[PDB]
């Protein structure tokens, strides 16, 4: 009869503090496109709402009781009630999209929320069945899962904006794919350096380099199976895993691709600046803030 | 080690108490060129003062030269930022944003620690900015309205040093002479022009300034308004050294840093005093020769997978046949009739797929459930994507407002299922009316969606009777839910149901029933013969009898509403009559 | 341990009695039953919801008003008996 137990889970996930990564990036792309201010805020609610639907589901599949400190939604409101309100926020978003006054904006939204879901389907295979992926399949799973919310905001932001500018989408989209790699690979490196990285038996970049090279390390493939039988390793066990990945040098090969990602990101900003000719210092305030 | 190598008293009745040049001077100049580029045209002479010192030239000659150029950029910027605080509209916001980020990029390029406090202080000062009685309360106004804490933190940035909060409270009275000085000292020279601007400020309230208040507070005009400032500043400077002597006698006997820092903070008052004496910023007429000087100076499966299994199970075929019946009343092209049946089949599979997960159901139709072959979470993904696959089809059938109908009967659909899930986890008995509205907007919601889409994309003339079909869908959505509860009782999740509401509304002393239910919500599922008892109590209180008082009342209202449609629209439909008979 | 089995106490009752729409409080006290133990992160959250709703403030009222009834009643018994009880005041004093 009422409308309170549906929006309840949404309010809780919104409350807890955040970072602003989704919000700041839109301001960074704002000064290359000259959007109005009425549309940008409407564009910024889709980012907050859709990223919130991502979180509520992700915690369900991790069983992580707490996020950042304050408890998770699936432990205060129940798994069944938090799944239901998650699917409502998706339908809610497709109401804001058609409030943007454009016919092909909807087409964009339901074309990059299907690639956002193929990536998650693969990621949930490689954790439930325990299959070590390939280094290139993995690097294709992340450009779609976490680099998919970025392309969706970008292409929508160039279709709503005053047209003038030519096919900037070509270079601007490529920025989104590479920025999604610098974020996931960073999150993996800042887990095995001080965790819950392996408590889900989650495959990260260090763990797919130490598992392909050195293919006879029967020790590591034994402590990666205890995770699937105890729902997560204990503290002494991980110090064995963490010391194991040092010998493989994976901690050194992760910091090697991070530098490449920051070089390709830097180059794209410079090249696209020589086109527009308006130095976007905001994107460089970001770039230094993640180093 | 203060460097006077490059750092080279009675002023207006009171005040008893850099060599890199271009590196700083041009560093300030860059700000004006950059700010005009983004924000707007250059204006009132900045921190420059060719003869008595371009701010940092006399105000802070002790700032380290390397950061000083950027500090002079800040010095100019802080001035320039205040100088204006003293498509194009959004571009002005954009013009703000960028050059706003220019400082941080440059400021965080030298070092983090000093910036941190300076960063925090800076916005704190601005926040403080956004009936005068005594002198001290305006000092509290203008201690942070001069930016001086931020400025002496910028001066603490001058030699790149911190003032720990314990020492801060220690030096808070020690620097209070100077902290309060920057209030009073600044007005004196600023007032001379600020009151010139105040005399042009017309709409002004009580003018926020020490000196102008002094003309009329106690009728001590100018020279005497100076004198109280002199009584303040000549003392406040002597009192500064007097308190610095107290600092020298007390905290700063040999306190190294704060002694050299108060040394720099001791040149602060004379630095603004020397600055304010003859600056073009304060005396515009000098600008021309000042300017003249400046002229010289990865697949498809694993997502569709779970959807294949639940779309390949033996189905009953009810939702698919309801559309088959109404079409005879409504008449629509065959191409658009199969389209809706695909939408109904997909959406229905979404509901069932999320059900077995939300009621622990380990099987359906006699076959293994869909959350036992593909996993609990891979199933949730497929459901959350089939809700998107339906939207692609809604657009496909040509209509601009058919989607808004879908976006409404899905909010109502989810609004009811939230209530059901509440009543089953937080065990709470709903009333008969509250249970009838939940099954109204959770089972009949799908029937409404199929009805209000057909009655909208049909070849016209089927719009006046729209309400009547919405009544059938509402009176029939109830039927399925109150007929399933008897087919299911002739509770493995202990789901509150229509017979069970009657039991716990007619006997509020049936302690036994609450205890075969709570044992079901706790252990998990009622065990086999404990369910035998639960049937017995429902047989001793009606319930079974009562549910056939509503299966009949509903079965009379369906046949009543069918008759009206037939007569009002002539055509006697017989598909719906056969479907109604097989439903009995 | 009171919330470990969700033993309804005075503050918790008033909090639920006052706000009929504090869905969060209802939810956590169900997590207590469903699992069995309210963890520390959840236990801190419960305390906050009470303070934002008062509850604790309400407790002092009764816990102080009850002190009024006993203190007044003891004086009445003191008068009628004609024998000053100083040992019931000790138990009273060592209880505050």
Curated annotation (Swiss-Prot), chain A:
Region of interest: Prenyltransferase: 1-291
Binding site for Mg(2+) 3: 58, 62
Record-listed dimethylallyl diphosphate binding positions: 67, 145-146, 184, 191, 202
Domain remarks in the Swiss-Prot or TrEMBL record: The conserved DDXXD motifs as well as the NSE/DTE motif are important for the catalytic activity, presumably through binding to Mg(2+).
UniProt keyword list: Isoprene biosynthesis, Lyase, Magnesium, Metal-binding, Multifunctional enzyme, Repeat, Transferase
Binding site for isopentenyl diphosphate: 19, 22, 51, 68
Identification of the protein by name: Variediene synthase
Oligomer status and interactors: Hexamer.
Domain of life: Eukaryota
Similarity comment: family membership: In the N-terminal section; belongs to the terpene synthase family.
Gene Ontology molecular function terms on file: lyase activity; metal ion binding; prenyltransferase activity
Function: Bifunctional terpene synthase that converts dimethylallyl diphosphate (DMAPP) and isopentenyl diphosphate (IPP) into variediene as a single product. The C-terminal prenyltransferase (PT) domain of EvVS catalyzes formation of geranylgeranyl pyrophosphate (GGPP), whereas the N-terminal terpene cyclase (TC) domain catalyzes the cyclization of GGPP to variediene. The PT domain can also synthesize geranylfarnesyl pyrophosphate (GFPP) from the C5 isoprene units in vitro, while the TC domain is able to cyclize GFPP to the sesterterpene (2E)-alpha-cericerene.
GO biological process: alcohol biosynthetic process; mycotoxin biosynthetic process; terpenoid biosynthetic process
Keyword Chloroplast on entry: no
Positions spanned in the full protein: 406 to 704 of 705
């Amino acid at each position: 009869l009422g409308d309170e137990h549906l929006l309840g889970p949404a309010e809780y996930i919104s409350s807890l503090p955040s970072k602003g990564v989704r919000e700041a990036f839109i301001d960074g792309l704002n000064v290359w496109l000259v959007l109005p201010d009425h549309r940008v805020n409407q564009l910024k609610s889709i980012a907050q709402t859709l990223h919130n639907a991502s979180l509520m589901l992700d915690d369900i599949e991790d069983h992580s009781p707490l996020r950042r400190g304050r408890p998770s939604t699936h432990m205060i409101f129940g798994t069944e009630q938090t799944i239901n309100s998650a699917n409502f926020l998706l339908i809610d978003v497709m109401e804001k999209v058609r409030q943007l006054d454009d016919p092909r904006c909807m087409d964009i939204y339901l074309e990059e929320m299907r690639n956002l879901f193929i990536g998650q389907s693969f990621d949930l295979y490689w954790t439930r069945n325990g299959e070590c992926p390939s280094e290139e399949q993995y690097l294709d799973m992340i450009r779609q899962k976490t680099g998919g919310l970025f392309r969706l905001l970008t292409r929508m932001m160039v279709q709503i904006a005053p047209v003038q500018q030519k096919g900037l989408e070509t270079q601007l989209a490529s920025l989104s794919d590479v920025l999604g790699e610098f974020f996931q690979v960073r999150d993996d490196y800042k887990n095995l350096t001080e965790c819950e990285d392996l408590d889900e038996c989650k495959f990260s970049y260090p763990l797919i380099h130490a598992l392909t090279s050195q293919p006879k390390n029967v020790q590591l493939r034994g402590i990666l199976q205890q995770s699937r039988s105890a729902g997560g390793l204990d503290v002494p066990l991980k110090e064995t895993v963490l010391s194991h990945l040092r010998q493989a040098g994976s901690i050194e090969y992760t910091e090697a691709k991070m530098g490449e990602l920051m070089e390709k990101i830097t180059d794209s900003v410079v090249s696209l600046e020589g086109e527009t000719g308006s130095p976007n210092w905001v994107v460089r305030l970001l770039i230094h803030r993640l180093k | 080690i203060l460097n006077s190598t490059l750092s080279s008293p009675d002023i207006a009745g009171f005040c008893s108490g850099h060599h890199h040049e271009h590196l700083a001077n041009e560093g300030s100049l860059r700000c004006r060129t950059d700010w005009e580029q983004f924000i707007g045209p250059i204006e009132r002479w900045g921190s420059c003062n060719p003869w008595e010192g371009h701010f940092g030239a006399v105000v802070l000659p002790f700032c380290k030269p390397e950061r000083l150029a950027v500090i002079c950029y800040i010095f100019e910027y802080a001035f320039l930022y205040d100088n204006v605080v003293e498509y194009r509209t959004v571009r002005s916001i954009l013009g703000t944003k960028q050059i706003q980020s220019k400082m941080l990029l440059e400021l965080l390029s030298i070092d983090a620690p000093r910036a941190e406090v300076v960063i925090n202080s800076w916005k704190e000062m601005i926040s403080t900015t956004a009936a005068f009685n005594n002198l001290e309360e305006y000092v509290d106004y203008r201690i942070i309205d001069t930016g001086a804490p931020f400025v002496d933190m910028l001066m603490r940035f001058g030699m790149g040093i911190m003032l720990t909060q314990e020492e801060q409270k220690r030096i808070e009275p020690i620097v209070k002479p100077c902290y309060a000085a920057l209030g009073l000292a600044n007005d004196y020279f600023s007032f001379d022009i600020e009151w010139e601007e105040f005399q042009a400020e017309s709409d002004k309230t009580t003018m926020t300034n020490a000196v102008w208040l002094f003309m009329q507070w106690e009728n001590l005009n100018a020279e005497q308004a100076k004198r109280r400032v002199q009584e303040v500043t000549k003392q406040y400077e002597q009192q500064y050294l007097r308190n610095i002597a107290d600092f020298a006698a007390g905290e700063g006997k040999e306190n190294i840093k704060l002694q050299t820092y108060l040394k720099a903070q001791g040149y602060q008052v004379p630095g603004n005093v020397a600055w304010s004496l003859r600056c073009p910023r304060y005396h515009p007429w000098l600008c021309k020769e000042a300017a003249s000087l400046l002229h010289q100076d990865l697949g498809d499966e694993h997502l569709l997978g779970p959807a294949e299994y639940i779309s390949s199970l033996p189905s009953k075929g009810v939702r698919e046949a309801f559309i088959d019946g109404l079409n005879v009343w409504l008449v629509l092209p065959d191409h658009r009739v199969n389209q809706l049946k695909s939408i109904a089949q997909t959406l229905h599979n979404a509901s069932l797929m999320l059900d077995d997960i939300e009621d622990h159901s380990p099987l359906r139709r006699g076959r293994p459930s869909t959350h036992m072959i593909f996993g609990t979470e891979q199933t949730i993904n497929s459901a959350n994507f089939l809700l998107i696959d339906v939207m692609e089809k809604v657009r496909q059938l040509d209509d601009p407002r058919c989607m808004d109908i879908y976006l409404e009967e899905m909010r109502n659909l989810f609004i009811g299922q939230s209530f059901d899930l509440y009543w089953t986890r937080n065990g709470e008995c709903p009333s008969e009316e509250q249970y009838l509205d939940m099954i109204r907007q959770k089972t009949g919601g799908l029937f409404r969606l199929l009805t209000r889409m057909m009655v909208q994309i049909a070849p016209v003339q089927q719009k006046g009777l729209e309400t009547q079909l919405a009544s059938l869908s509402d009176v029939l959505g109830e039927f399925f839910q109150v007929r399933d509860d008897y087919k299911n009782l002739t509770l493995d999740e202990c789901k509150f149901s229509y017979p069970l509401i009657h039991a716990l509304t007619s006997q509020p002393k049936n302690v036994q029933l609450r205890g075969i239910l709570q044992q079901s919500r706790s252990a998990g599922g009622l065990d086999v013969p404990l369910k035998e008892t639960v049937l017995s109590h429902l047989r001793q209180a009606g319930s079974i009898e009562y549910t056939e008082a509503k299966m009949g009342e509903l079965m009379e209202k369906i046949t009543d509403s069918v008759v009206s449609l037939e007569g009002e629209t002539g055509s006697p439909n017989w598909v719906v009559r056969l479907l109604i008979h097989r439903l009995k």
